[PDB]
Each structure stands twice: as C-alpha cells, then as structure tokens.
Amino acid sequence: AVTYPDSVQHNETVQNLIKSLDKKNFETVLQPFSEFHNRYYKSDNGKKSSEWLQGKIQEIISASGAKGVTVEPFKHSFPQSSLIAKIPGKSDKTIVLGAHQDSINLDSPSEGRAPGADDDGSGVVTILEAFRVLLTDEKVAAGEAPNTVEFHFYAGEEGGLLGSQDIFEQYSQKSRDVKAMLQQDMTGYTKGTTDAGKPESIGIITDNVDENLTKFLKVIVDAYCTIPTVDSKCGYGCSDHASATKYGYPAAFAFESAFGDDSPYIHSADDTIETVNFDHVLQHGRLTLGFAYELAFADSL
Ligand SMILES: *[C@@H]1O[C@H](CO)[C@@H](O[C@@H]2O[C@H](CO)[C@@H](O)[C@H](O)[C@H]2NC(C)=O)[C@H](O)[C@H]1NC(C)=O
Numbered sequence: 001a002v003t004y005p006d007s008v009q010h011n012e013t014v015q016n017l018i019k020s021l022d023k024k025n026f027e028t029v030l031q032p033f034s035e036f037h038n039r040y041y042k043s044d045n046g047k048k049s050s051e052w053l054q055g056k057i058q059e060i061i062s063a064s065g066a067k068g069v070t071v072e073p074f075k076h077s078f079p080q081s082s083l084i085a086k087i088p089g090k091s092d093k094t095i096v097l098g099a100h101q102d103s104i105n106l107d108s109p110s111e112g113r114a115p116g117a118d119d120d121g122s123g124v125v126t127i128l129e130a131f132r133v134l135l136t137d138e139k140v141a142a143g144e145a146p147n148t149v150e151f152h153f154y155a156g157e158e159g160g161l162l163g164s165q166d167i168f169e170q171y172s173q174k175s176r177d178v179k180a181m182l183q184q185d186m187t188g189y190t191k192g193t194t195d196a197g198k199p200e201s202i203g204i205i206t207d208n209v210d211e212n213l214t215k216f217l218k219v220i221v222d223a224y225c226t227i228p229t230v231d232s233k234c235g236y237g238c239s240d241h242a243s244a245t246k247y248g249y250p251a252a253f254a255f256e257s258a259f260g261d262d263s264p265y266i267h268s269a270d271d272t273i274e275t276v277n278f279d280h281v282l283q284h285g286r287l288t289l290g291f292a293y294e295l296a297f298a299d300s301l
Pocket residue numbers: 008011012015223
C-alpha cells in the first residue's frame with residue numbers, strides 16, 4: 001500500500017521549471033526518431049533505434065553536468081534493448097516515468113513502415129524533455145532529492161509489454177522499491193477530440209492502475225496543466241503500466257484524449273509526425289515535470 005500528497009507542495013519551483021520546457025525539442029528528436037523505417041523490437045531496425053535513443057539520452061546527461069546520472073541498456077531475448085536512466089537520490093524509494101520506444105506495422109511487422117510518431121514517439125520525447133529540464137534543478141542534479149527517479153524507455157511493448165515485463169519482474173525479484181510509476185503512451189493526437197467539438201484534454205486511464213496514484217495524477221494535472229482531465233478505461237492491459245501493476249507496484253497512465261478519440265493511425269504506416277500536436281505534448285511535458293518533481297521531494301513516501 002502506497003499513499004501520496006493531497007496537494008502540490010512545490011508550485012513555485014515547478015512553475016519555474018515549466019518555463020524551461022522547449023516545444024521545439026519534441027519535434028527535433030521525434031522527426032529523426034520516426035524516420036527509422038520501423039522500430040520493430042525483433043528487427044535490427046529496433047536495435048539501431050534503441051542505440052540512437054541511448055545516444056540522445058546520453059547527450060542530455062553529458063550536457064547537464066549531473067555527475068551521478070546514468071543511462072544503461074537492459075537486454076532482452078530480442079535485439080532491441082530497453083533503456084533505464086537513473087537520477088540517484090538520498091533514498092532508494094524510486095519514482096519511474098515510462099514510455100515505450102518500439103513501433104510496429106501490424107499488417108507487416110518486420111518490413112512494414114511504422115513511423116510510430118504518436119505511438120509512442122510522442123511519449124518518448126515527452127519524458128525525454130522532462131528529464132532534461134529536471135536535470136537543470138541543482139538539488140536534483142546533485143543527487144540531493146529525497147527519492148530516486150528513473151526514466152524507462154521500454155523495448156518490445158508492441159510484442160505484449162515484453163520489455164517492461166522483464167524489468168518489473170526483475171525489480172520485484174530484487175526488492176526494488178517503486179513508489180510510483182507514470183506511463184505515457186500516445187500524448188500528441190488531439191484531432192479526434194477537437195473534430196467532435198470537444199475541448200483538448202488529458203485522458204486519465206482508470207483501469208489496471210493504482211487508485212491513490214491516479215488521484216495524485218489528477219492533482220498534478222489540475223495544478224500544472226492548462227487543459228482539463230477526462231477519465232477513461234481501455235478495457236485491457238494496454239501499455240507498460242500494466243506490467244508495473246502486475247508486480248504490485250503503484251502505476252498510473254496519462255493519455256492524449258478520451259480512449260475512444262485517440263489516434264486511429266496507430267500500428268500502420270500512417271502514424272506520422274504530421275498527426276502530432278506539439279502544443280498538446282507540451283501539456284504532457286508539464287505534467288511529467290510536476291509529477292516527477294513533487295514525488296522526488298516527498299519524504300513520507
Ligand atoms: C502556482 O503559482 C502560480 C504562479 O506562478 C499561480 O498562478 C497565479 O495565481 C495568482 C492568483 O491571482 C496570480 O498571481 C496570477 O493570476 C497567477 N499567475 C500565473 C502566471 O498564472 C497558481 O495559482 C499557483 N497554483 C497553485 C496550485 O498553488
């Protein structure tokens with residue numbers, strides 16, 4: 001059982017970090033990331049895209065001056081490796097931000113074009129940019145936050161959550177102490193919402209998640225985003241948060257829209273960067289920042 005703050009504790013600090021978010025950084029990474037023919041987890045394509053992503057993560061670390069922050073691959077039985085970046089804090093209580101890094105063309109997995117721009121390139125560059133801004137905080141970069149923060153870039157999600165399955169099963173076996181896990185998977189498609197006359201929102205998924213953490217996630221969005229929430233269910237274990245839930249860890253999941261208004265282009269050649277609304281992924285950047293910072297600095301977790 002894990003419990004959370006009732007209201008945000010660091011509004012001033014987080015609002016100031018939010019000003020350092022740079023909308024252009026999403027596109028600058030997402031454009032070449034989605035130019036891999038696909039990022040299929042069984043393919044040398046997915047191996048190369050994971051290596052490319054690791055270099056982009058490393059560039060941010062080396063640029064940050066954060067001496068103790070690392071990124072390391074996590075090997076699987078398939079060629080594409082997951083990536084775990086760690087910001088060590090004073091305790092081993094760990095906050096995880098997740099996204100998956102593979103893409104797939106369901107009709108032609110090995111050879112088909114799969115730009116995976118919304119699914120899940122949008123979530124990758126969302127948490128990548130929040131990671132960079134988090135490292136501009138001197139306390140975080142010094143290793144001085146109460147809690148440890150990890151950023152997970154899961155391989156093989158399109159095979160059935162295969163990378164996050166390997167990671168959380170190992171974490172569980174080694175008694176890793178994950179106090180919160182936020183998954184972000186598809187953060188850029190708003191056309192489904194606005195086409196129907198609805199206002200742009202953050203979708204909160206309420207199945208296969210922890211009730212207390214999900215309530216905390218709504219607190220984060222109400223404080224640090226400028227668009228409202230909408231609750232939705234997917235009806236199955238639709239992303240890597242379900243791997244955390246499977247091993248008892250508290251997980252939550254923020255989404256681009258109500259589930260029925262999400263991108264109809266996923267898992268095909270049509271999931272392109274032209275479908276992504278970078279003002280919306282900026283809202284997901286704000287919530288990733290606030291979620292990570294508020295929980296990194298919660299002693300009673
Ligand atoms: C977090 O801080 C922001 C300021 O950065 C607060 O927003 C301000 O609210 C007061 C109320 O009148 C005014 O100074 C401005 O209207 C707001 N400023 C901006 C830039 O929006 C915000 O209310 C705080 N939120 C929480 C939850 O504490």
